[PDB]
DNA sequence: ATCGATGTATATATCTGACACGTGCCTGGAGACTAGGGAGTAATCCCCTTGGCGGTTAAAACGCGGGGGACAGCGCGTACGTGCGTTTAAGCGGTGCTAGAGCTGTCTACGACCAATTGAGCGGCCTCGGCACCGGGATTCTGAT
DNA sequence: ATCAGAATCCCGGTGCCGAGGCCGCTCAATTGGTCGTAGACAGCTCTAGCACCGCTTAAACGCACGTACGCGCTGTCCCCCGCGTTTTAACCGCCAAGGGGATTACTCCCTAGTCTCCAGGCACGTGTCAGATATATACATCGAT
């Protein structure tokens, strides 16, 4: 029933106000809300209000699943991301593994070689780096971009609210991961009209579409939803 | 009415060409290439009429030296006819494509 | 003891001095200092050998900045022959200043 | 077709004959642009060396040393054209 | 006069008169003794030790960079192999050498593995 | 019981060989070969420690190299399994048999 | 035997295993029985190619001992150079 | 006293004095022993006394008089020691020596 | 003429006078003598540039008869090898006869 | 097994330009000589090489079980060889022009040799911390349920 | 996939011997300078390289046809892998002892350098016969009946 989600929502945002260190975790149904290109595709509001969340401090770290890359395409600042499956945006050199951005998709996928061969320059005169430019979607079930595992991991060992939007925990060790905050003896909320494996897990559960809650949830925090002022590049917050 | 079998008559050019001194390409094609490969180099070159013969002598030899490795790999994997992957296989194992 | 000590050369010091000034903040063992001596006596024979050549070739006496220069472009590929022949323009340039 | 690229010059009976001189009975019909890729690599190589000899004598001219010169340097030795 | 040179100049040799750390009186020394010509001019020595110097530069970063990323942080021969088959250019320049105690690059040929399930 | 399939260890035996760096061959039987061999070209060598590990080093990296190109005969002929024929074709393209 | 020996059968000495490992380091999976005596016969040839030069290096310097520098040159010549021994 | 070329006191034809000049000129050390160059013509003669043998016989065996540059690669090509010597030459116009795998030929 | 001459040198006398005394009814083609003209200087330059290492490695300064001995022993294969020195050896001690 | 027509052979005469030989010229090999340093030769120090022995325990060797790989058969589909008629342009010979290879002359900036002066680089010694080892705690998987 | 439980990872302790710094001394690099010739620059001449014209006919091209090869699949056998027990000798640490590397001092045989002498080797010329071509004719062999 509608009163129970707006009482639930409700309590979502003394959660949230509450709580001193939240983690969010992602997965494609909130990417896909405004109806899904992924170059043509505008990110939609839940992104923008998770942004809105960064900026008012209510955001330690952010985890998703989403190839879409639309959290990049948010300007999301980088820095407090991880995407743990690869972007269609995103690209990386294997001789320094140093990485990039880009106006166009990648393309390819697979940890596949781009066509690109570095720019990073070098003191003392020596070549420019040469090294082979290969995509970040990582096929199936590797073990994950290396940083953003341990990140979304130490986060996870580190995070008193952890919250799941558009989310099935079942990837792993993607889901798994906010069950490290539970484990430490922080709180877990799951939203999602979908089954998931760790359903039993969490101290709050919703079930209702994603971005209604999550608008309910800004207008609780008292926070407009900033619409998206075309696409956005933010390495830092 | 007659024909002779397939085979048969690359098998008596195989016999035929190896009795052979003579070069294989056409000569100017051969002085065409070599002068497009060089403009990238440097413009506005000239070429030894014996030069160009330097360069038609090693080259062919070269292929031919190449297409007997070539059919070595090729007969070793139970083919007769040489493939793409004999010659990239030639050329990783003599350390061109490496 | 008893005067019987006998000096052997090797880049070994230069080698060090180079890799202080890329990573100052790294080491080297005594067996990769024995390969990085020998690899530049290799090159070394190499880049010297294919100058005789050169001047032989053209009838000239005399190892100069030219035959040093086009057997660097010869011997090293890629982009690897235009560094080189940057860092020894600029090298022979500021050693030139001044003259 | 008159708007020849140069390395078609290079054409296909060519290759059989170089092949058949090789001692190949078959030939498969993608060969011919692999063998022409592998010819244009080996020119290149050549004809570096050649000119890079060329530019060091200060002539314009590409001469039968400068090559045989190149060919040496490569691993290659041709006897016919000089020492 | 010669008593200039006795109370004067002070030595700048040729190395930190161009700028380098390889000993350009060293190089000329062994080109001369090595009988590569009858003669070597003064740009020869100074431009074979800038190269040289340049091609060890280039070899040692990409072993540090190696040395590191094994969490070591003194080069040993397993880095010096890592450093110049994972490069294509000093890969080919050293296409005949062994490196003692180097090892190979981790390398398996493709199709000796197993294969995996998927979902989109 | 327990029993890992044959070919997983072998995949894992490779797995840590390509990582390590130490020698392969035990190190007494080598000197005695190369003591054997070098006894038909003089009587009463000897020789520098040095000496025999630069020849173990050169010959079991020589060995290793020459087992990659076996390898790439192998898989080249449909097999995963080498045999004396994927070795004589390497030996036969690289030039030390023709 | 405290001097003058002679030697023979030490070509067994390059175990099965040993082998095996060899092949391991050069990527691969599996070996038919037949290689073992191939490799060694091969080994053997590499072998004693190697061996000449490093002796007549030390027959040409008038020494009995083969020496490091030896068999540097000797692969040096063979178009096989071996970095990390002094040369 | 009348000159005798050092080549005929040697007993051979290669030209003793020749090798000598171009061992001194060609910088290969700092000094070229008298040894020397009678050793490296009497090889050179050697060597060249061994192909010549084996063309002349290809020669004649094709019913020619003159060699030309097939006889050359003849001669090369069926010897195991020459082919060893001359492993990486290619000789112009020489052609390669007829052979043909097995397992092409036809069936019966 | 105005001394454009410049007397172009080649071994073909010497190539003619070994066919003659090997086989004396056979001619030489010039296509050919050209060819055994390059392997005369390939394999001198091969024989002397060895004869350069041996004598560098051994810190002499000489090439000497046992430098193109040991040369001769590394460069030849097999029976080829023991057949050169043997004339190599026969031509020295003649023309050390009676010196 | 025979039969036929195709291509390689073979026999002939005939015409032609490359090689073999002859002659003139000038360059470089030779002859007899001198000067000094390279390397032959012997005597010594003492390094490191070869040999022998006794314990240990890691690796090699032998066996046995069984499963995954080689490879011989056979089936099917398309790709490549043989052929023939039409189009292209390579090859030939001839004529024209002038860029640049090649040689000869003149000059001077470069670098080999040399002696006197100094500090950059080597061998040796010593300190201490990067890292090989490992035993202990956790987690991060893989087998047990 | 749920369940403990391996199976391995991550970490703190410990320890040693190899890397880095310091010292001192000796010999290789530097300095300033002179000498003479290698080679850079200019001027000329005449080779051979590039461009163009048109003619011939060998070659490349392109289209048709069908045979045989590539390679996809499958079944059967045996050969190699993994693992457990036993046997072996590799390894290591010690100790013995002398062969032969390496360095030194002596010293004379050898080879760079020199001037002049002269005949060998190169370029230029011309003649003819080894070989290439055109034509006639016999045999070899492939493939169909
Ligand atoms: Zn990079």
Not at chain 1, 77 to 95: I, Q, S, T, W, Y
Not at chain 1, 155 to 178: E, F, K
Not at chain 4, 59 to 69: L, Q
Not at chain 5, 91 to 120: C, D, F, H, M, Y
Request: aromatic share 6%; with cysteine; net charge positive.
């Amino acid at each position: 029933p509608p009163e129970e989600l707006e009482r639930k929502v409700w309590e979502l945002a003394r959660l949230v106000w509450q709580s001193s260190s939240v983690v969010f975790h992602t997965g494609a149904g909130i990417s896909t809300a405004s109806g899904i290109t992924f170059e043509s595709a505008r990110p939609t509001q839940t992104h923008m209000a998770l942004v809105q969340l960064e900026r008012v401090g209510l955001l330690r770290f952010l985890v998703s699943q989403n190839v879409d890359g639309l959290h990049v395409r948010s300007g999301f600042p980088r820095d407090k991301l991880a995407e743990l499956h690869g972007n269609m945006f995103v690209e990386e050199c294997a001789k320094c593994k140093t990485q990039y951005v880009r106006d166009t998709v990648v393309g390819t996928m697979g940890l596949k070689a781009t066509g690109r061969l570095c720019t990073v320059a070098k003191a003392r005169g020596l070549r420019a780096c040469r090294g082979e430019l290969r995509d970040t979607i990582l096929d199936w079930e590797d073990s994950l971009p290396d940083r953003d595992l341990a990140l979304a991991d130490e986060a996870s060992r580190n995070a008193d609210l952890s919250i799941t939007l558009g989310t099935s925990l079942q990837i792993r060790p993607s889901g798994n991961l906010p069950l490290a905050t539970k484990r430490r003896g922080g709180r877990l909320v799951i939203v999602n009209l979908q089954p998931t494996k760790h359903d039993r897990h969490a101290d709050l559960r919703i079930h209702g579409y994603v971005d209604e809650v999550m608008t309910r949830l800004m207008k609780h925090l008292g926070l407009e939803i900033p619409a998206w002022d075309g696409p956005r590049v933010l390495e830092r917050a | 009415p007659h024909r002779y079998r397939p085979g048969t008559v690359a098998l008596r050019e195989i016999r035929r060409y190896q009795k052979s001194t003579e070069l294989l390409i056409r000569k100017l094609p051969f002085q065409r290439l070599v002068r497009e490969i060089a403009q990238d180099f440097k413009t506005d070159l000239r070429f030894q009429s014996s030069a160009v013969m330097a360069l038609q002598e090693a080259s062919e030899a070269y292929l031919v030296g190449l297409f007997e490795d070539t059919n070595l790999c090729a007969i070793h994997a139970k083919r007769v006819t040489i493939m793409p992957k004999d010659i990239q296989l030639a050329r990783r194992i003599r350390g061109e494509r490496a | 003891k008893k005067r019987r000590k006998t000096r052997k050369e090797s880049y070994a010091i230069y080698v060090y001095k180079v890799l202080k000034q890329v990573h100052p903040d790294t080491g080297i063992s005594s067996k990769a200092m024995s390969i990085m001596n020998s690899f530049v006596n290799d090159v070394f024979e190499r880049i010297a050998g294919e100058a005789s050549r050169l001047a032989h070739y053209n009838k000239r006496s005399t190892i100069t900045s030219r035959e040093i220069q086009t057997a660097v472009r010869l011997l090293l590929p890629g982009e690897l022959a235009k560094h080189a022949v940057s860092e020894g323009t600029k090298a022979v340039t500021k050693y030139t200043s001044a003259k | 077709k008159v708007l020849r690229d140069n390395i078609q010059g290079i054409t296909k009976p060519a290759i059989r004959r170089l092949a058949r001189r090789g001692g190949v009975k078959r030939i498969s019909g993608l060969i011919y642009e692999e063998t022409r890729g592998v010819l244009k690599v080996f020119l290149e190589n050549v004809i570096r060396d050649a000119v890079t000899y060329t530019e060091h004598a200060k002539r314009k001219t590409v001469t039968a040393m400068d090559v045989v010169y190149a060919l040496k340097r490569q691993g290659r030795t041709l006897y016919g054209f000089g020492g | 006069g010669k008593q200039g040179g006795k109370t004067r100049a002070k030595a700048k040799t040729r190395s930190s008169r161009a700028g380098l750390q390889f000993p350009v009186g060293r190089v000329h020394r062994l080109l001369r003794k090595g009988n590569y010509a009858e003669r070597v001019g003064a740009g020869a020595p100074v431009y074979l030790a800038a190269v040289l110097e340049y091609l060890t530069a280039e070899i040692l970063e990409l072993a540090g960079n190696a040395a590191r990323d094994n969490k070591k942080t003194r080069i040993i021969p397993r880095h010096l192999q890592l450093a110049v088959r994972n490069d294509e250019e000093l890969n080919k320049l050293l296409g005949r050498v062994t490196i003692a105690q180097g090892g190979v690059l981790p390398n398996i040929q493709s199709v000796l593995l197993p294969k995996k399930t998927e979902s989109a």
